[PDB]
């Protein structure tokens, strides 16, 4: 009587209705986005969510409102199936969907354990949305937001809720394993109990790096030559072999990509021994050491890595002053105070299984979540040590599936990986300097799925984000996104959205999302329920410090620091 | 459609008795393309065109029939839909590396971007020397052998000599001196084979001028061969393992036949998945190649037509002219443009069809579409559908889970399609993070998993 | 008519007026009286459309911005907050707590 | 003090941000229905049924409006004593002349 439909397109419905304010009748909030439910028989009926309203005037009438309505799928005694039925004929009764209705959207697609609530429908704020649980972290989560719409609250929301997701059979840590990678140190304020580690607590290896990361860390791309490159990965992989413990024949398996331990300042020695070598008449390069007197052969290159080693030879050698870019380039590195944390002298006390135990928080202070603040971390090994994770992440997840499957019980750790600000580790560019995390990225979203080690890309400016990395998640969270180009991006790169509910992306509320995926039973837009910890960063406050007067007493402090 | 001639797997949507036959024949030989967005069932589709087809008997014997199916699965989806097929993971799965071509070769060996030309000179030279010794047939034959030639040859003599010419010096002839247990030589096109093996001692005082140049390149190499990930196509198995036992492999003609082969694609590193999609595609179109050979002489046609299923088809053919997937795409591609006329054809399968090429995907006939809510994936399609009938190619994201948009030549019409209910849907063995995430903190876990890494 | 939305796209408000007299690209539509709900709307062009039979009427284009409540400023454009339409004289110092209050 | 006079007998070519700030519209016969379409949109103002008058103007008759103007209307403008009238070169009269052949010699030595 007061909405009726005027035309069944096969997209699209178009409603036309008389009074809106009669219309909306239980004083239920109708907008775009708002759920129509249009049938004249009870417990059969097709929900259609709204594109865009509209006017008509017939010039001689009353004006009538039209609603573009789009058919989302048809409910039937609580089922929800999706895409638009054969009820929808323009003798038909359409009016806001009832809360029966809306709930069963989303609750009948869900089994009653699977159920992961961390938002609210934004239309309609009784009803809740539960995603799949099960199907939204094991398939990579895109969290993509501009600057203001409360993104990291969304990503903070749905930690808690997973830390906070527990069986009532026990009290205590639940088996929630999150890795954060914050280089703006934002989420410590939101996870108090999180286990948060900086440069100042951070000790990563450095002898997990492969040739890859091993060769950016070190050396350059633009002043190095060949021959410098050359004797590296020679001291390198002939360092491996006499530190490596185990059984002589997996030595001859060591190469310049294997993560093995070697020691940095002996591979500083034969850069610097090589350095001054010299020649004679027979080209053999015999040296002079404390222990004895040898020439240079493979069999005994490995007493070269001591200090006390004099060169012999009445000649300069032909690569003698050769490595001075090369000896002087990693002995500033090594005692580089912002690289103490990689190239330190605990890098190379510390072992394999207390690395681990720190990344995942498996050590003393055992933690749901792993914050790796990154702020401290150098821009430019800042790509490495992510790559050095993300690596050492998958690797042991793709060990995880190798123990159970033998023992046919799987008691299983799942990883989730948050990289917050995702572009900056995994972008659309293919500079080499970008290389490392990018692969290492990829071969998360690309592999690790089924090794029990996902990511969760959490970014500002989803249009620099690689597409072979931003399309393999399948659940994408869109906060209120503004820019045309990250729009354009998203809106090419989302696979699954209702009619024009994608087209919302600019005008969202803050905390107002746009969630879809294979965890949702359909594109809906949600509104994400209120952190009590909120993701805080703390941050110098400028304007504060400002107006302070001119105290200057702390610079005659700061240059005894720096002394 | 002719009696004998309609393989139904459907019925119509908008009324369930009409059942929607498609011309069988017609519906197999020329590629499909069934394609659908997250869940809309695209694999349940899949499952069921292909238990169809599996099913698809004729009443005078019982057994197996003669479908051959491939499926390229890296979701590791169809396992549990078909439970009599045979799965080949990594860890089952046995791809000689020599079978490579020239292509596939150095992807998975080589970076263009670091390696210089005269690096890469040195692998193809070793790699072509090494395949006519190892080759057993007439010394005619060994003329025509090249590096893109599919013979056997041994990666470790390959890597043997590339170390070798990493310790290449001259003497005051200026040759390059090789001193060997057998004999002392220069390095000759007659004698390079003595420079495989490992027991070569260099000779001449004065090093090369590329002495020194391939560790960059050797390195690289040493890590492959020994990789565990790798053990698949550079170990030990892939040397023993015959040409005639990957074939038997690949379409299931060993001790345990079955009409579907999976290949669950899963475990294959991201790096050299295009590489062995495209060596198992182009194994499988030159199988149906030379399979024609014979059966013309043979003037009576046995026949074993084979349907490759690419499942996630946009990522080993996709839009982009990249290197990486030069290889698959390619393969791919003569299985699209020639594969018709040899009994090789495909299926492409995607949620994201608008990756998918147009070269490839304009060369399937029928495809099936399910929902299609992402707008850049309708653009797509509805640019490259053969056939239409009016405003019902604009009905595809409002299609139900399970209910399909089918044209082609193989149906009288196109129309609005209700795909058969999977009685055995393919489920995927995930894990299921919430259920794990629910049960306490497991601890004793941990310490198993670091001594498997050491 | 004074000044009313006859269309509610997802991002845009066309709202159409008989005459400029009866501001530019990017002004702020504030025609409010109503207190603790109201609409607050950004101009994106002037457009002018052909009738053939009736007197030429402007209609605007308006991005919704945001949504005030009490004098608290919400961004994000919600369509339920403009059910009044009247014509007295109101207040201007309302644009201030879209800036002011954050 | 700068001012323009855009004069163009195909109105429709000029871009709208240049043509719009000039608000006193002259206009003679225009005929063209894109011509017409385009500035009939682009009117700082109208009366109803004499926009429609422009492609069944005189010769010299002339529709002006603009805030100078007083209100649209219909206007005939003044004969030219002494009209605009451009020198060109007359084809029918010079064609059907005699076939001029020394005037060719005189050009190539000037082109050389």
Known sequence: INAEVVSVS???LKISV???????????????????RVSDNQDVALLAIIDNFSIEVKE?????????????????????????DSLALPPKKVEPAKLDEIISIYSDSIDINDRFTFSSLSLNTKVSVPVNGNRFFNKH????????????????????????????????????????????SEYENAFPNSNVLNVDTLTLPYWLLNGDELEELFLDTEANDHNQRNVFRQAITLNKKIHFQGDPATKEIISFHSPYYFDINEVINYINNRNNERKNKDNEHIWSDEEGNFKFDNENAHRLFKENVTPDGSSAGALNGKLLNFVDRLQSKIFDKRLDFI???????????????????????????????????????????????????????????????????????????????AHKYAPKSDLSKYRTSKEAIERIAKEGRKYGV??????????????????????????????????????????????????????????????????????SIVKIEKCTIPPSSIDIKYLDEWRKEWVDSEFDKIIEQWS
Do not use: W
Request: aromatic residues 8%; negative net charge; hydrophobic residues 35%.
């Open 10 to 12: 096969p997209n699209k």
């Open 454 to 523: 996902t990511l969760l890309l959490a970014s500002q400016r989803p249009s620099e984000i690689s597409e072979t990395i931003f399309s393999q998640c399948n659940t994408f969270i869109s906060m209120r996104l503004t820019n045309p180009d990250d729009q354009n991006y998203v809106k090419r790169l989302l696979p699954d959205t209702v009619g024009d509910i994608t087209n919302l992306l600019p005008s969202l509320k803050e905390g107002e999302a746009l969630i879809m995926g294979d965890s949702i039973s359909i594109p």
């Open 343 to 421: 190239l330190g002298e605990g890098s190379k006390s510390v072992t394999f299984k207390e690395t681990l135990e720190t990344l995942i928080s498996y050590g003393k202070d055992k933690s749901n979540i792993t914050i790796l603040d990154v702020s401290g971390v150098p821009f430019e090994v800042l790509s490495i040590c992510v790559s050095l994770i993300s690596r050492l992440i998958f690797e042991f997840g793709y060990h995880s599936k190798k123990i159970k499957r033998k023992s046919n019980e799987n008691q299983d750790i799942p990883i989730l990986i948050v990289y917050e600000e």
């Open 60 to 84: 001689s009438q009353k004006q009538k409102y039209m609603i573009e309505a789009s058919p989302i799928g048809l409910v039937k005694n609580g089922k929800f199936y999706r895409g638009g």
């Open 141 to 184: 989560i895109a969290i993509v937001g501009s600057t203001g719409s409360g993104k990291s609250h969304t990503v903070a929301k749905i930690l808690q809720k997973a830390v906070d997701e527990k069986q009532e059979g026990y009290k205590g840590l639940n088996n929630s394993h999150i890795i954060i990678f914050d280089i703006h």
């Open 18 to 36: 008389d009074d809106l304010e009669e219309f909306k009748i239980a004083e239920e909030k109708l907008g775009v986005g708002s759920y129509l």
